[PDB]
Paper text:
[name] is one of a few pLGICs for which there is an activated, open-channel structure, and is therefore a useful structural model. In the extracellular domain (ECD), [name] activation is characterized by a counter-clockwise rotation of the ECD relative to the TMD.
The effective diameter of [name], which depends partially on nanodisc size, agrees with the trend observed in the structures except spNW15ELIC. spNW15ELIC produced the largest nanodisc particle as expected for this circularized scaffold which forms 15 nm empty nanodiscs. Comparison of the agonist-bound structures of [name] in the different nanodiscs also shows progressive tilting of the top of M2 away from the pore axis in the order: SMAELIC < saposinELIC~MSP1E3D1ELIC~spMSP1D1ELIC < spNW15ELIC. This is evident in the mean distance between M2 Cα atoms and the pore axis, especially residues 249–251. spNW15ELIC also shows a significant tilting of the bottom of M2 towards the pore axis and the adjacent subunit, narrowing the pore at 2′ (Q233) and -2′ (E230). However, in spNW15ELIC and all other agonist-bound WT structures, the position of 9′ is unchanged forming a tight constriction of the ion permeation pathway. There is no density for M4 in spNW15ELIC indicating that this helix is structurally heterogeneous in the [name] nanodisc. SMAELIC and spNW15ELIC show the least and greatest agonist-dependent changes, respectively. The nanodisc density for spNW15ELIC was smaller than expected possibly because the position of [name] within the nanodisc is more heterogeneous.
Numbering used by the authors:
A (entry chain E), B (entry chain A), C (entry chain B), D (entry chain C), E (entry chain D): 11 to 284
Amino acid sequence: PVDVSVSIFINKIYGVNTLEQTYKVDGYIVAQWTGKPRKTPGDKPLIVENTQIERWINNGLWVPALEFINVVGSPDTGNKRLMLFPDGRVIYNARFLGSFSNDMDFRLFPFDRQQFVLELEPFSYNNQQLRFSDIQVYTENIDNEEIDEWWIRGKASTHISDIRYDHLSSVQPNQNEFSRITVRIDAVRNPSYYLWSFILPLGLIIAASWSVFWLESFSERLQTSFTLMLTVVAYAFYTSNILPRLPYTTVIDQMIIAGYGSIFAAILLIIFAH
Amino acid sequence: PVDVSVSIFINKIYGVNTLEQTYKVDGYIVAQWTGKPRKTPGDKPLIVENTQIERWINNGLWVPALEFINVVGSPDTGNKRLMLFPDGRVIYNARFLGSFSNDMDFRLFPFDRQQFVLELEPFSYNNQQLRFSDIQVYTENIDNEEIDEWWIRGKASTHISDIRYDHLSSVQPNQNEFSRITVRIDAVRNPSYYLWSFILPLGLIIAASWSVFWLESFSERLQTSFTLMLTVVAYAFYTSNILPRLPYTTVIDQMIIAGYGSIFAAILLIIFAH
Amino acid sequence: PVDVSVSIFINKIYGVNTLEQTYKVDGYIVAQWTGKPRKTPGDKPLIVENTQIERWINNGLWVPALEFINVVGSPDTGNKRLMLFPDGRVIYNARFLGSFSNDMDFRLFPFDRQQFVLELEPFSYNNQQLRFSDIQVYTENIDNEEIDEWWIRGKASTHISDIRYDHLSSVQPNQNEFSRITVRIDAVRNPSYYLWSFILPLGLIIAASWSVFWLESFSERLQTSFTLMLTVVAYAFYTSNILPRLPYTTVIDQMIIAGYGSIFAAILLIIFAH
Amino acid sequence: PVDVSVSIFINKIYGVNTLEQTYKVDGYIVAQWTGKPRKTPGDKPLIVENTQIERWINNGLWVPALEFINVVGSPDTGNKRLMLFPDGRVIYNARFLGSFSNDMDFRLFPFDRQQFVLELEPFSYNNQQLRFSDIQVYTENIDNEEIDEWWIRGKASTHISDIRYDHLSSVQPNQNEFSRITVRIDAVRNPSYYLWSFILPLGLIIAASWSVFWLESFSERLQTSFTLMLTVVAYAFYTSNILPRLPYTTVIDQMIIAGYGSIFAAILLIIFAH
Amino acid sequence: PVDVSVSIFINKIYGVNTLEQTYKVDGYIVAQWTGKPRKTPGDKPLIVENTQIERWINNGLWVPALEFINVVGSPDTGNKRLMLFPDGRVIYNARFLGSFSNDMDFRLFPFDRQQFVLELEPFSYNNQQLRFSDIQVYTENIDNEEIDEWWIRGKASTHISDIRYDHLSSVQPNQNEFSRITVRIDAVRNPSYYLWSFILPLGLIIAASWSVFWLESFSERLQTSFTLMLTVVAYAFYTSNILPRLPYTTVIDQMIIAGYGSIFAAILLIIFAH
């Protein structure tokens, strides 16, 4: 089994779409392994850039195809480098960009602590043919940065495991477990914008809804309550465009439901009084 | 006729757009068949990855093109593997991602029970040239998962049938029936978000619309009724962006129509009283 | 002139964007012609699938490029088949998907009767080099189906004509007329959704606007009339997102204008009374 | 210098996005020049279609790359034809589709008179190596047509000029001026939809805002004025989605500002009266 | 180390999306270096256009791959020219178009002064193999232009630095520093549209909110205050669609918060008075 040393450098993390539950990671991947010795022209190592790499693969060079498990669509791979050394070591450099997905729960939606997970795996070579030696993840550009509305905390966790694929067991009986690399980056959402845009004005709405019981009337009090109902509907307008359609309720959703319940409680209270 | 054994592994199902009536399925497809024996270098089977596969096809290797019938656009095929064995068996591995479409009725829109259908078929080889032996669908990653707002129930149904194409009968008189694989995954929509976002607040609107007949007046009662009309129009705003434009009416649509009818009934009632 | 028999099979028609005045047609195209006899290996016809077709074109095989005249962008061509027969006949099978455009008038917008037109034409071969023998259009999948909000009525009309190109007359003086195939599918819009979503509620708005003259007041009547004005503006909100920006007025637009005129007529009437 | 005769045929002009200030032009381009005589098989001219053209370029054939200067993104080039004649003349036919951009001022926004400009230029050959002889633009399909909301007036202007590039002066000292073709099509916007959708209802709003001074009250007059303020805000909602963010003000924008000023003038007037 | 002289010509800067914090730069890049002397056919320099360039790279020609560091996605590279001179000098011309990103702070959002940064760097060659001699940036087309809503001030700053990559230190111990070119264009936002669209009408809202204390009542004053609350919510609707979700507050956001605070201050003031 060929031992492959991966070095994932995260250039930037952007495009975090909470509705689609996806994010875009740009960076470079450096895979290194030792193969058969070769006689390159000159004692210096020879560098193969994009396209010229194929001629070498048609000649018979072994280059693994390292795919991303949790990618959405084909990754937008840019330039590729294949640096071949006389001794035998091969260094494969490539720039990747793709949309990655995660579970991404939203129980505490303004105060999310989500993990950006990159899963890397060979497409066709199992651990009896290709083993991952180690990975160092260099998240130096975004180690402590306020990317989008997200705070990156700490370093990036690295993990190497074996994944058994039961769909490949019928075609490959004894050898179907694949070496997988998991790269986890813990991210904390910045809650400031939601704090001054949603929670505080809806709190003012709740206070104004409490303030309707100071009238010595019944009809214009009803019109006031339905004006507040229209205002709460207005606040529920641009609520579903910031978080996905979740079966559970979040803080903004419970505040909207509390506003609806407060208005309807005022309605039933004045109807019971009448 | 070459017998081809397919093994569709569904990695994830996502992007279920109810307006477009489409969904995105990501996964791998494993086609296996036995051909002529060949002398690979070494007794071990030889693995061909993306691109190097073509050289083999130019040499004269028979590799079928398994298309998706119900796909929207070209599928975003990633890496491909062609694992050739000395004996003769050929294993074709490929990763697919495309937008698939189904009939997808919405009679009970918050309580949908839709089927995600994948149809697989050879493009050019009929059942006199290529027959599908069997398919095992491995939906283990999403067997019981809350993907998007959808619940996957049970396993995946497998079916192999023959499809007669009458447009190919004029060019191929006696041999125009094609072997087709249908993969059905039954999905149940999670109704919780709609339950606390649409039905309950519109029920409060209906209760408030009932509550207008407690006024001893005529003009401000009219202004109250038109304020409620504006509120129901506001609720009809973000109604057409969650389900497609259907000839029939659904539960949210009947609740909106009931609100409109209740307000107009109040209008005609107070006009008849005056 | 080579006689080419086309057989267009319409798999589905979807994505009918009335704002862009475009629609998406998916299906297969079967072109058949007789060329020089050839000695294929074996008496059976030889099938060339995607990619391997080019090698044959580099060898010198004559394969026409049948383009779509009214397409928007490049068509998303999937798999291609080239079935070569010993005798000489060549059958060209290809799967096409593209956005097509038509004139698509909207005088009676909820009750549209539009035609989906597919125009097929060789790119480089005129009728002195390539003539279209006949076309049979097999619209069997959508012969009577409720696709989107559209009803497909009857069969598909077929037509073969010669198109003179005056821009090619300066470079080709005597031979610049091209054989063109026009495929027309008559479609009827389903008016039910608009009937229960726009016409009926706006009729209720018109009735409520008539109902303002029952007040014995002047100021709160004015406030009622401007509340109705705000409601009509709300109904004009999600009006321009369902049909394109047309110089003429349609039924929804005339209903909105009638609502505006009714409110302003009420305003001028009460001002004249005062 | 090789004299190249261009013949641009405009099939259609569509997708005029005023916000992006871009438009989509579909059509064919016919470039013709005379080169070295060649012995084609047979006295008839030989036609090279897409792909087979490259083999000829690898053989050493001189085919210029005619780029579009004002294009947005890569043009969506479809089929290409290279018609080679025994004598020597070469005719290059290609179908282009791309997003083009212009200055596109909006001083009189409902009554725009904009020019659709296509700029064509060789990428690498200057006028010491490639000169444009003439261009005839055949805008016969859209000579007098109501495309989108735009009226095409007259024919298309043709112009051939030399463009000096100062960025190529350091690498090419004496020869850096390039022959450029400018194709201008004058377009007039159809003002009918805006006339019955924006100007007339906002005029009714202005009349109703004038009508507030008929009340013998102060509080409900204030509530009426703020209802009209909410209506003008509603009309300012779907105002910024039809024209881009311009430093200057247009007719719809001045009408909105006049409505705001009229309401605030009413407010200050009644406050001064009180 | 090969000295490479770059000449970046900025054709246009457009598509400045403040929400995505990205912008689109179109233009041409001219890289020039001196290599081994060659015997071209004829004393004149030989021009290689797109595609034919590869044959030369397969022959063994050294052409660097100059990537963009801050690009979003793959750049939409169009035509490429490789002009080879007898002496030895090679001129590489290419047209690039891609989405670039910057830090792009928005402390003074209507009065932004942002920098459009283009970072250019070889993908595989370090400064021991490729050194950047100089860069001249020719921003002559947009030197003083009102592109979008942005004013370009002055010329473009040029900078050449060495970037040490610590992720390449494990694979290349002593040689991992790369020559980088930074091109900065200072841009000033045009504040006119925001000045007459947001600040002035919200100032009128603030004045009207001050004007509520002129009523001798309590209930209709409350209804007036909640009508103003609904108007401020309406103004907060189309506020989050022009600037991204920032942790800090900007001028429009502070004006919205001031309106909310003024209305709630009026509410608490009249409640304290009652």
